[PDB]
A paper describes a structure:
The chromosome region maintenance 1 protein (CRM1) or Exportin-1 (XPO1) binds 8–15 residues-long nuclear export signals (NESs) in hundreds of different protein cargoes. NES sequences are very diverse but each usually has 4–5 hydrophobic residues (often Leu/Val/Ile/Phe/Met; labeled Ф0–5) that bind hydrophobic pockets (labeled P0–P4) in a hydrophobic groove formed by HEAT repeats 11 and 12 of CRM1 (9–16). Here, eight new structures of CRM1 bound to diverse NESs show several different and unexpected NES backbone conformations that share only a common one-turn helix element. All NESs also participate in hydrogen bonding with Lys568 of HsCRM1, and mutagenic/structural analysis identifies Lys568 as a selectivity filter that blocks binding of non-NES peptides.
Histone deacetylase 5 (HDAC5NES: 1082EAETVSAMALLSVG1095) and Paxillin (PaxNES: 264RELDELMASLSDFKFMAQ281) have NESs with non-α-helical class 1b pattern (Ф1XXФ2XXФ3XФ4), but the peptides bind according to the class 1a pattern instead. This left no other experimentally verified NES in the databases that unambiguously match class 1b pattern. The 310 helix favorably presents Φ1 and Φ2 into the CRM1 groove and natural class 1b NESs are likely to bind similarly. Class 1 NESs are helix-strand peptides with either α-helices (class 1a, 1c) or 310 helices (class 1b). (A–E) FMRPNES (light orange), SMAD4NES (salmon), HDACNES (slate), PaxNES (pale cyan) and FMRP-1bNES (deep teal) bound to the ScCRM1 groove. Because most previously studied NESs have substantial helical content, we also study five NESs that match class 2 (Ф1XФ2XXФ3XФ4) and class 1b (Ф1XXФ2XXФ3XФ4) patterns, where the hydrophobic residue positions do not suggest an amphipathic helix. All eight NESs bind HsCRM1 in the presence of RanGTP with dissociation constants (KDs) of 670 nM-20 μM, and were crystallized bound to the previously described engineered ScCRM1-RanGppNHp-Yrb1p complex.
Author numbering:
A (entry chain C): 0 to 376, 414 to 439, 461 to 1053
B (entry chain D): 11 to 20
C (entry chain B): 63 to 68, 78 to 199
D (entry chain A): 9 to 186, 190 to 216
The structure:
Amino acid sequence: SMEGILDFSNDLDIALLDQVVSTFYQGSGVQQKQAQEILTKFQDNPDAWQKADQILQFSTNPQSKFIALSILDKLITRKWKLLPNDHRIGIRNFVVGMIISMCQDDEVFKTQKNLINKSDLTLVQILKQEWPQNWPEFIPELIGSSSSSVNVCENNMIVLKLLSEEVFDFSAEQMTQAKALHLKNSMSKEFEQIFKLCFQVLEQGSSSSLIVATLESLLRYLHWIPYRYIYETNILELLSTKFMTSPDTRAITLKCLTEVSNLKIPQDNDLIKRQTVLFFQNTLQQIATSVMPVTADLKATYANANGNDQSFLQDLAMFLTTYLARNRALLESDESLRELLLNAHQYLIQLSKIEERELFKTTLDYWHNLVADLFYEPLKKHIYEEICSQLRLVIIENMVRPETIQLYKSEREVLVYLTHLNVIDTEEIMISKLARQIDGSEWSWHNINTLSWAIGSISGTMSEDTEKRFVVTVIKDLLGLCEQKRGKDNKAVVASDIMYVVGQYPRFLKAHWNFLRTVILKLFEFMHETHEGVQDMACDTFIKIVQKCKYHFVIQQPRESEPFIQTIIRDIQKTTADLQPQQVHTFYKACGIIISEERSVAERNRLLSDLMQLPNMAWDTIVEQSTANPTLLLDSETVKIIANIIKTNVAVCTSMGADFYPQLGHIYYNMLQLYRAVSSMISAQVAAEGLIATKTPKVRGLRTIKKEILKLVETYISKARNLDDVVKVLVEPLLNAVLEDYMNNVPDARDAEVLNCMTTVVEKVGHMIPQGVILILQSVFECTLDMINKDFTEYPEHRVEFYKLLKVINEKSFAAFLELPPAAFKLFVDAICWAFKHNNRDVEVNGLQIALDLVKNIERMGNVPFANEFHKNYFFIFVSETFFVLTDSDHKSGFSKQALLLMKLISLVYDNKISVPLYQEAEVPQGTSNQVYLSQYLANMLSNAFPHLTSEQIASFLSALTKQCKDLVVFKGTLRDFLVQIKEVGGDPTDYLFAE
Amino acid sequence: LRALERLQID
Amino acid sequence: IHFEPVTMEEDEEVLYKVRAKLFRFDADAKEWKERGTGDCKFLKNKKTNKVRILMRRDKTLKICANHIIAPEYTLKPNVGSDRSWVYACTADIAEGEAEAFTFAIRFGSKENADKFKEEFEKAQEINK
Amino acid sequence: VQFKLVLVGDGGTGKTTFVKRHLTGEFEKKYVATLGVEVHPLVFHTNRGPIKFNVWDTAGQEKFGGLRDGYYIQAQCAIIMFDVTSRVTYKNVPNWHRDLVRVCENIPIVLCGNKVDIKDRKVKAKSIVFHRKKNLQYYDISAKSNYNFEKPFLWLARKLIGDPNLEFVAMPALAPPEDPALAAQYEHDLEVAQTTALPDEDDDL
Ligand SMILES: Nc1nc2c(ncn2[C@@H]2O[C@H](COP(=O)(O)OP(=O)(O)NP(=O)(O)O)[C@@H](O)[C@H]2O)c(=O)[nH]1
Ligand SMILES: [Mg+2]
């Protein structure tokens, strides 16, 4: 029944409209849904705009008049210039009239602000089309009609605000470069008249609604107007006094003054300097007397959230930080300005205590600006001693967990600066906070952690003798604090914090060996503590200390008979007996860091052998009984044992890289045999159970083995220094073990890690194995492409790794693509373009890079038959496929790299780098230049793809584009101009001369 | 800080 | 001188508590759908000794499972998991009217999953 | 006691998946573009009583935009969504905000960067500053991991009710209730359920 408005042969029944609209806005459930589909189909009728005047006149429903204006908006912005000039004048007239009649009925003006704002914006769309060339009197007549009515003057302020926004704030994406400049110039020409009106209203007006809308528009003007309108009038005085007193105007005025603090200002006129000081002085004065004194508890006020207090305190933070970052030097040398300077910073101290993460980040960035300046600028830091002293306490008390990573690093930076500025104050604050943990007055899990992080963050700022006294005092107090408590939970927290601080002071650990030893031995004791988190803490602290202090584990210390690494390896089974496998691997990885500090080859390899003794024996056993009867590999326990052995090798190899080679050779050949046996079992299970077998624990366990073997090989090869051995010992067994298995498994059983592993092989040694790269392509290219070329969705990992592999092959061993049969080289081209069309950034970016790199490979071949055949076969495929993703609105994330590729393609022809004609002997006169043919191909291509463009538009665009194919920034502007023009009818072809 | 050796969680 | 100065499960007992993720089977899409992640609690009513499963989502605390551990129910493994149980439920009231579901519940480890089957079968007897 | 919430942002940012998580607890992996708008009531239990959100989940893809800014009429709160793995979605935040506050001049608004569960994050924390001058609340969220997934509604509940101490609380859990002609019917549905593997078997839960 509701579907009747969709019949346009009959008149539009307004009453049926208002019922559909109401059922959508106030209705619910199925009725609401139905009305929605109707309203969308109605609004999307390309004729609905004709019935807009009916609705605006004879509807009583503001939602329906709003939809009417949306239908008009679509028409003005997309099809305006196609209309008979009659309709254009008509539409304009009954939008102007509808607005006047709404402003005159004080009742409608009061209650229909949403419909009035929509009408204003619709008017502003017309201005973007018609003004000032076809409407030169708009501004004068607007200024004239303002004095005849407060409601009309107020609404004119809203029209100008939206106009300023559309011209200066939001034009970059929505208009051509030429059209934007024209409107900016036009507004600039008549601004003197607009400012006059705006300043009179402000100085005389008493209607707060009129005032607020004038200040709202002023906020927009300050983005672009010249400073003289601000500094050569009284308006700073008004903003910083009169309008800071009223809470109505206060929020908008403050945002205006924030922008004023950013105006382009000559930094050498003394009077302007005094004006910048003065309006800051006034503003702080109004806040102290009308809002709150500098002593007020802003933390409590923000938490109470009365009225707009939270927004106001945010805006004050933004004002103070913006102004002071730019102008605080103005206040630092005059003694009469010292109180103002420090009161402004004291407000910031109070703002910095508010519990509000994002606001804290805003003030924290300012503090960084300040303490960095006090660290370098002569004679400044004494000014701020008392501000900085308070800041130390604020930052220490609001320290966040390290490893919210970004906020901790910012807090650490500010606190390190503040420690350099006064070490003594920092040390005293931290010890004092520590006593109130011991004396229980501020003791809490949160509070003791916060303080340990703060103590840990300043490592490196004290002298080593002060640090030594400081660290000692901190640990001593902490130890006593742990004893003081009972119950695992409490004692767990303090003991962790103790280890955190220790881990942060490696300079101290390096100089106190006996202490370092005791630390480590305690971490070991904690690797048997089953309390939740202790063991993870012990292991993370152990490796963290090792990364920093490794040299002290590898030399023989005085009073020790052996390097301590040997003592760790001897007891490693005991030490790790109660750890979970992840934690064991971290432990072995930490040991590998130490072992790589030993530069004597024989001793390094012996340490390596001893460290791997347990996994190597479990390995030998398993290889012995695994080969006996391949039944075991069905034993989930043996599969878990195998994967954990491999993971241990990955961990140690991650630490040792090139040094890991001897251990790799101990397992390499049997590990690849194991890869094959596991492969057969996976295949055998998928045959006996179907594809669902890949989801079962047993098969997932077997695939884990294969994946960790590939990760191990990848990890070693990406770090190897001896590439002769990589090529002549590692690569051939590896390719024989993995390539055929991948090609001949069903898609759901192929591991994408095989692709990632091959990408690394090509990366590091691709140049040395051209036959191996060919073998790789043969085995993975076509069968992987067929997995991923049916949709953009399936096999997401294979997709990504596929194009990482093609990318590296195209860089390092481009010969492999030359050897492809012509049929398969054509699939390679198809595959590149396929990548263009992904929204998945991982895929899309590599697809554009491969295309770019391929063109360069082809270019470097010179005038030879393969290059000539490539341009004949694929040049225009690349030009048109690139143009497609450039213009279809669904690949905006790749604009830049689409542009680059397009610019390279076009430049080849305008530099005569293509030796054969790109056309058929037939289709063009003999002797035609590729330049001429390219311009014809593109004109025809765009004419059929964008039939609503004129021949002249297309020709001016292509002339500009080809002319600018050496200037990427300009080329890109011309492309963006084109993307605007295809969205509408009637685009000015002269826009494309903007660069010229 | 040889009192570290007696650090216990209990 | 005297100065004048200025849920609905409280009647139950928690037998078992474990963290888990709960799925419901959409047969019309042959697709498992998540229903909630949180603490799964076996709650014993003191005034009847009947044991139910009550499970709430983290943060929002909305109920994603509320039903008796009926003695007829049977915990079945799922093909792709060694740490989950599948079983049909004829009357769950997490989202209004008692409704029937094929549930799946997964845990952090096979250990927690087996122990859950332990407690789940213990509770089944309690309900008789 | 219900409030209209409009949810806007670029296509693919996770708006519909985020709402769905709150409605049913499910995580939908497929991207099925919203067409125009979908309206869903969402109720939360607080210590001040239940609060009902009427969520207007709008479409971010332009060719599916439907009524566009007409969906915002009489909204009382809003969420702007972007994708921290896609810079373009954050570059478009000011455009959605513009189109929103022209219709809705003073409403609480939350800015959410979705998909922080993905390792290769492209919109870095320090680059996200648009909310400051616009007085928007900001949250990193993940509809996949549920990181901060409740924060946008908790903050809005507090603003809309005017109680900064409003908390979510546990809905009361009634006692749950207690034929052979369907034993073979549930056996069919159970055999299928067992042989359909559970998703995301590598997640901690
Ligand atoms: N990794 C990850 N993926 C997510 C997350 N949230 C949503 N997605 C996924 O992103 C894609 C888009 O989800 P969707 O809800 O449809 O986004 P949308 O904003 O509603 N799009 P539209 O505006 O067209 O309706 C889906 O594939 C979804 O699974 C997230 O938090 N993390
Ligand atoms: Mg959607």
